Amino acid sequence: DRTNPLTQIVHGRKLSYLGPGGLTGRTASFRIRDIHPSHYGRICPIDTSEGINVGLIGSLAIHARIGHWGSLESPFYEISERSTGVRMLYLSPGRDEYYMVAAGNSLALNQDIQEEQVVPARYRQEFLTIAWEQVHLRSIFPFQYFSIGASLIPFIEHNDANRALMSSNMQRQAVPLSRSEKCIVGTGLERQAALDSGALAIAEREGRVVYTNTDKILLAGNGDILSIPLVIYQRSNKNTCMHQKLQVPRGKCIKKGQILADGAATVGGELALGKNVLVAYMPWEGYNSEDAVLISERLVYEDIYTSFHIRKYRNLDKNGIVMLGSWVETGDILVETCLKLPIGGRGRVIDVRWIQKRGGSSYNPETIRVYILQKREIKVGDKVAGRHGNKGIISKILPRQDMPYLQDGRSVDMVFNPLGVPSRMNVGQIFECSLGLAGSLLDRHYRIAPFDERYEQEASRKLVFSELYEASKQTANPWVFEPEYPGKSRIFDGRTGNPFEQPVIIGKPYILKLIHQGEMEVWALEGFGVAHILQEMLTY
C-alpha cells in the first residue's frame, strides 16, 4: 500500500490469525479476539481490523522480535543487585510471567529506606502492588506497548482506546499534499517513520555534494563519484503522486545515513500528512449539527489542501495515441475500439508508454499505458480528520469576511462542533490545539513522549498553560491566555460583528485530508404499501 509513507511501514508489521492452517472468520471463537495479558509489549492492544475479521488481524509492537523459536519477545530491564546490575533482557512470553514486572517511578519517600514503598506490578498474569524489594524486571520504554499508528497520536493518555483505533485507521487514509509542513505538536516518532519509510534519499557514502540537479545528485567521496536518481512525479499503487526534493546545498559534507533528498509527505525527515489550520469549536447555523466542518475559503485559493492524483488506463495523433500535454475531458477518446476517459476523470496527460512487449512472455500490445494528472482542490464533501479520532465532512465554504474572527483580527479557517468532544471522549485534541497555538506564536515545535503524568500529576496541564502564558507575555496577545478561562477566548461574528456570549476553544490542530470522499429494501417497500414501485424496481 503506497498511499502514504505510513502504510509502507505499518503493512509489514501485521499479524494474521487466518490463512492456510489457521482459524477462519466465523469458526474462530469469541475467546480468541479478546486481549490477553501475555500480549503486553508484543501485540498492540489498539490496532484491530474492523469488520467480520475483528481481533484476527493485529499489529506487531515496536520493541518486538522473533526469538529463534517462533516466539515474539519483549525487552525488560533488570533492577536486581547483581554483578552488572543493568542488562536489557529479551523475555519469551512464558519466561516473563515468573518475574515481577513493575512500571512505576521511584519518586517517593515516606521516611524509609525507599525500598519499602509500594508500586503496581504484574505477576502471574495478575496485577498487584508490592514493595520495591520484590521487583525483578522493569519496563522503561514509552513506545514499548504500542504500534506505529497508536504512537503517532499525541496525548494518548487523555483519549479512549476506541478513538485511538479510529485514529490509527484514519492515519492510513491520508493523501500526500503538494507542499508539506511539519506538525507543531508531535510524538517524536515521525523521524524514524520517515527514516524507515523508504521515500527519503539516504547517503550510502560520505563526501561532498559536487553537483545538485533536479534529476540526480552526485556525491564525491575519496575519488569515487556516486550518482543518486530522484523520483519526479511518479504514480503509486493507489493513485498518489511521488516526488522528491533536495535539502542539501552544493558543496557540503555528508555522512552515511543522513538525508540528501526529501520525499513525498515528508519535510525535514519527519512525516507530514497534513497542515496546521486555525480552528474554533462552536455551533454555526446547524451546518455542523452532525459531524461536519465549515471551512474557510482561504484553503482553496492559497493551495493548502491541494493534492495530485495519477490514474492509468483532435487530440489523437497519427498513430492514434493521445499526445503529451493533452487536456482530456469526460467522453474524449484516446488510444471498445478506442479507450475513453470515464466520468469524473479529466487532467493533463503527462506521459504515454506503448506496451508493445508485455513481458507476459509475449509481446502484447493489448493497449498503451496512459497517465493523467488531476490536481484535486479541497471542495465540499471531502473528509478531513485529525489524529485523535475526530472526523468531519465539509458542509460549506465561506469567504474570509464571513468567518468568525479573533480579537487580533484573523479569521478562523475551520469550525468544528463542540458536542462531539463529550460524545467520543477525546480530551487530547484541546491540549493539541492550545499547544499548537502557543508554538505558532512562539515559533516552536513540540515533540512529547506518551504518558507524561509519570513525572508528576497534571503534567500536561502545566506543559500547555506555561507555553500559553509565555506566548501571551512575550508577544502582547492577552487574548491567548485569559486567567478567567485558560484555553478559551472570546470571538466575534463575521456577519454582524457582535461577540458571542460564551468563549470558545481556539487553537491550531493538525488536520489531515482523507482519500475516501436487497431484501430489507423490499421488506420496507412492502411495509409502506408501494407495490407498483417495487414491481418497477424489480423489473429494472
Partner: protein, 374 residues
C-alpha cells in the same frame, strides 16, 4: 547591597568538563555511541553525580534564585566571548572576568619530547589557567561576598595557587566563608599521600567542604572500606536488617573523619550523589535520603552536571537560612532542596541546558517527600 548574598565562583570556564576520570570495569562498544547511554543508567560509582567547572555552579545558583559572580580570565577569541555571553544571558555577574589578548581560551601549548618515554611539558598556559593577582582580582566583588567557591582544579597549576590563596585571604579578611568542592582531577587519583600533601593548604582554609564518597574513601582508606562493604555474614544476620541483602549506605562515624577536621571547619558533606547526603557538624551528624529516578527518561538520561546543582542549592539555603549551623532538622529540610535539584538536573542532555529553577525544585520536593518532611 541586595538582599540575596552574593557568592563568588572562582576557577576556570569550560563548556563540558568532567574532571573525575578513573578506570571503569564494564565497557561498551568502541564506535556505536547510540548504546553508550546504557552506562548512564547504571553508572560507575565515581560518576554517579559528577561535578564541573564553577561556571555551571554559578549558573545553577542564579537559576535556583540568587546572585553569583564568576571570577576568572578568558581570551578575546570567539570561544571566550561566547562563554561570557552565555553567562551574561543567564544573569551571572561577569564584572570580574578579565580579557587578555595574549592566550587563547582552552588552548595549552605542550612539547612532546619523546625521550625514553612520553613526557610532555607545558610551555604556554591557557588564560583560564593563568590569572594574576596584581590587578585582576576585583576587590569590590570580594568585599560583597559571603561564600567563596573554588574547586581542586586550580591546585593543579602553579600559576593560580598563589592567586587562590590571595583571594581566600581577602575573602576571610572581609568576612566571607570559603567553600571547597574537591572534584579531584585525573592526576589527583594517583596516590593518597601526594593528593593529601597537595590539597592540604586549601583544606585548612576552608569552612565548608563538600567531599565525595569515593574521594573520602580515597583520602582515608580504600581497601579497608572495600572490604567492609563485603563483610558477608555466614551464620546469622546480626543487625536484623542485613537479611534483605540491599546496598551498603555506610554512615561514617565522626571518629573516622577526625584526621580531616580542624578549628575553622563548619560543615562537611559526603554527597554519595542524589541518594545520601551525610552532613557532619562539630556538634551533630546525620544523613538524608534521596531518590535517583533517572530511569524515568531513558532517551535523555544525562547526568553530566548533578553535583553542581546540589552545591548551588546548598549555597542558596546557607545564604538564605542562617539557622542551618545550629540546628539539625532545618539542615535536613534544606538539604532535601539540593537533593531535589540534583534529581531534576539529570533529565536533560547538557549541564547548562537542564539546570532547574526554584519553583520546579520545590515542586519536586513537595511531590517526593511527605508533608512532615518539608
Amino acid at each position: 547591597y541586595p538582599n540575596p548574598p552574593l557568592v563568588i565562583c572562582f576557577g576556570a570556564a569550560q563548556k563540558e568538563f568532567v574532571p573525575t576520570v578513573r578506570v571503569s570495569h564494564e565497557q561498551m562498544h568502541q564506535d556505536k555511541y547510540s548504546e553508550w547511554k546504557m552506562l548512564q543508567w547504571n553508572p560507575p560509582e565515581f560518576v554517579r553525580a559528577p561535578g564541573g567547572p564553577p561556571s555551571n555552579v554559578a549558573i545553577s545558583h542564579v537559576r535556583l534564585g540568587g546572585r553569583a559572580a564568576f571570577m576568572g580570565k578568558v581570551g578575546n577569541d570567539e570561544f571566550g566571548q561566547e562563554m561570557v555571553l552565555l553567562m551574561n544571558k543567564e544573569k551571572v555577574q561577569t564584572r570580574a572576568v578579565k580579557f587578555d589578548d595574549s592566550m587563547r581560551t582552552g588552548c595549552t601549548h605542550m612539547k612532546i619530547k619523546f625521550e625514553d618515554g612520553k613526557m610532555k611539558v607545558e610551555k604556554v598556559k591557557e588564560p583560564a589557567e593563568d590569572s594574576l593577582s596584581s590587578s585582576e582580582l576585583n576587590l569590590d566583588v570580594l568585599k560583597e561576598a559571603r561564600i567563596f567557591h573554588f574547586n581542586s582544579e586550580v591546585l593543579t597549576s602553579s600559576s593560580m595557587r598563589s592567586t587562590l590563596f590571595k583571594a581566600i585571604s581577602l575573602s576571610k579578611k572581609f568576612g566571607g566563608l570559603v567553600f571547597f568542592d574537591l572534584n579531584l582531577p585525573l592526576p589527583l587519583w594517583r596516590s593518597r599521600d601526594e593528593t593529601r600533601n597537595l590539597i592540604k593548604e586549601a583544606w585548612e582554609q576552608a569552612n565548608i567542604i563538600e567531599v565525595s564518597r569515593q574521594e573520602l574513601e580515597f583520602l582515608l582508606d580504600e581497601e579497608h572500606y572495600e572490604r567492609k562493604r563485603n563483610y558477608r555474614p555466614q551464620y546469622f544476620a546480626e543487625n536484623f536488617e542485613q537479611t534483605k541483602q540491599r546496598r551498603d549506605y555506610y554512615h561514617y562515624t565522626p571518629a573516622e573523619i577526625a584526621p580531616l577536621w580542624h578549628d575553622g571547619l563548619k560543615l562537611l558533606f559526603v554527597t554519595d550523589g542524589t541518594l545520601r547526603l551525610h552532613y557532619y557538624s562539630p556538634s551533630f551528624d546525620g544523613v538524608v535520603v534521596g531518590t535517583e529516578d533517572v530511569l524515568i527518561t531513558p532517551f535523555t538520561c544525562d547526568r553530566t552536571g548533578s553535583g553542581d546543582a546540589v552545591v548551588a542549592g546548598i549555597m542558596r539555603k546557607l545564604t538564605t537560612q542562617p539557622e542551618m549551623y545550629h540546628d539539625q532538622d532545618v539542615l535536613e529540610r534544606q538539604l532535601r532542596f539540593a537533593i531535589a535539584a540534583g534529581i531534576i538536573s539529570q533529565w536533560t542532555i547538557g549541564a547548562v541546558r537542564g539546570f532547574p529553577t526554584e519553583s520546579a525544585t520545590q515542586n519536586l520536593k513537595e511531590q517526593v517527600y511527605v508533608p512532615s518532611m518539608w
